[PDB]
Amino acid sequence: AMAIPKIASYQVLPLESFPTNKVDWVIDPKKSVVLVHDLQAYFLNFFDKTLSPVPELLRNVNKVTESARSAGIPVVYTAQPANQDPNERALLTDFWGVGLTQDTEIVPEVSPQPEDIQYTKWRYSAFKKTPLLEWMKEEQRDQLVIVGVYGHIGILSTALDAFMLDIKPFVIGDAIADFSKEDHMNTLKYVASRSGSVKSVDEFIDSVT
């Protein structure tokens, strides 16, 4: 089993470097949901939080959720629970060990508001073992705007599952972070060419206001 590495700091990808979208979907405030993916103390503490990309990530997540709430867009947070039953954790243990035992709280900078939804996360994808798919169908919302960590792992897997489940995923390039700038960029490149749309925080704000 690997440990999540001590993540070396890196610069947030310039907006000019975002990969070009193959699809021309537009974020619709009537049909979208914002997903704040696993922004727990445990996952973010693997970085030096005073250094890029973490301060930009947290301020940009706040920019996304504030404009989402003002446009009546539901905000959903995912969080892994502490001391996962080995039978429930299953194959994750083989790669990553027993998982978090503490620091499960969402970081205070992006703390959920009373009206926000909070789901217990069990796999890379936010759709596995959660009510996300059925709840989005109930809400008649078919667009998922994704922010959080880590790009090539949970963000990628959630975007792939959304796309295959007929939900349009929009990954916010300047509102995610990863193990490195290369992993972060490669996540955006894969999504834009094979599984969804890559947008900036300003493009999200512009589309929903």
Next chain:
Amino acid sequence: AMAIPKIASYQVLPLESFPTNKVDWVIDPKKSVVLVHDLQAYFLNFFDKTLSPVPELLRNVNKVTESARSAGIPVVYTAQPANQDPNERALLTDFWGVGLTQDTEIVPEVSPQPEDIQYTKWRYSAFKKTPLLEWMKEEQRDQLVIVGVYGHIGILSTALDAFMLDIKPFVIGDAIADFSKEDHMNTLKYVASRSGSVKSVDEFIDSVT
């Protein structure tokens, strides 16, 4: 909408260049299933079939299936159906168009045997809208040995779903092909470090005989 490109010829990755496995799972003939992923004339026609990696891919898929059948390992083929209903095809149309309208047959070199299972494929992952998961649970088999095309798309998505569904995916590095040698290698690198195991045809034969 993109067309599957005219795939240029490339050399099958040397065995010495395969990424190192992070997990130490071993293919068990009592617990495994071989998946021949979308090896249809339609998908294979995008390469010049007389040039590398196609002759070696077909020969290698055959080495895998013959060894599997001799060890009593079920062999499952996935195939996309022609003229998919736009409502069923959904978001795939935005990236790839209406999909295949003919050439749905499995390439004759690796044509299914009477005892083999054949499922109708609808998404990148062989688990979506198929009986694969429930049938593997019925068979009490929790290992999926993956061969076929294309590495970074269907093979990758099937491996991620299997892993999240508690099924151990083993991608056969010299029994897959992709859009390029880089995509092929990057698929193996991602699987080995985040979602499964990467093995050679000889390692599969050795494990099941």
